[PDB]
From a paper:
Anti-apoptotic members of the Bcl-2 family are broadly recognized as promising cancer therapeutic targets. Human anti-apoptotic proteins Bcl-2, Bcl-xL, Bcl-w, Mcl-1 and Bfl-1 have a globular, helical fold and function by binding to short, α-helical Bcl-2 homology 3 (BH3) motifs in pro-apoptotic proteins, as shown in Figure 1A. Competition for binding among BH3-containing proteins regulates mitochondrial outer membrane permeabilization (MOMP), which is an irreversible step toward caspase activation and cell death. The role of anti-apoptotic protein Bfl-1 in cancer is less characterized than that of Mcl-1 or Bcl-xL, but many lines of evidence suggest that Bfl-1 is also a critical target. Thus, Bfl-1 is an intriguing therapeutic target and biomarker for resistance to cytotoxic anticancer drugs.
BIM and PUMA bind with low-nanomolar affinity to Bfl-1, but also to anti-apoptotic paralogs Bcl-2, Bcl-xL, Mcl-1 and Bcl-w. Here, we addressed this by successfully re-engineering PUMA, a promiscuous binder of anti-apoptotic proteins, to make it highly selective for Bfl-1 both as a non-covalent and as a covalent inhibitor. Crystal structures of Bfl-1 bound to PUMA vs. FS2 show that epistasis arises from a substantial alteration of the Bfl-1-binding mode. FS2 binds in a shifted and rotated orientation relative to PUMA, and does not make a key salt bridge that is conserved in nearly all structures of Bcl-2 protein complexes. Crystals of Bfl-1 in complex with PUMA, FS2 or FS2_1fX peptides were grown in hanging drops over a reservoir containing 1.8 M ammonium sulfate, 0.1 M MES pH 7.0 at room temperature. The PUMA and FS2_1fX complex data sets extended to 1.33 Å and 1.73 Å, respectively, and were phased with the Bfl-1 chain of the FS2 complex model.
Numbering used by the authors:
A (entry chain B): 1 to 23
B (entry chain A): 0 to 151
The structure:
Amino acid sequence: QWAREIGAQLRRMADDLNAQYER
Amino acid sequence: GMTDCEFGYIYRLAQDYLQCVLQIPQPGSGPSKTSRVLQNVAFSVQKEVEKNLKSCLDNVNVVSVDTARTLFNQVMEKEFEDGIINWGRIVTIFAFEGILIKKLLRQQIAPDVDTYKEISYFVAEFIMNNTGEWIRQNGGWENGFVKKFEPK
């Protein structure tokens, strides 16, 4: 369960980070 | 340049970042321009991941390179399963290998000084096989990543 939760949460954080550079 | 999406270049980026996290000195003038920009943003993200997922990561025991590899691939498979690639997601790959190397430093049953070279190797495999085409199409590290992430 933990690895799958980490992957989903990394996606969320990555896409938020990405929006600061891909406008 | 156009070929910076190939294995050797990516492996060097992945190794450079783990040496940064472990505070290992790599001698010379210094890391490349790509690595210098990547290390700052990847470390910022790494610290936020460590804080946001602290409860989850407390249940994570990274006791061997084989566990690090399966865990990395499980996490990355899920992160990327929607088929989307962007630079933010690529940055999180580096942040996550930084978390793995810190956990190994504490928890690895049989540590070896070359461990970071093995971790960065499977990280480079994943980046190349799953994101390399997208990286090339978007200008690579030099014309894509650095241009978007370097200072204004």
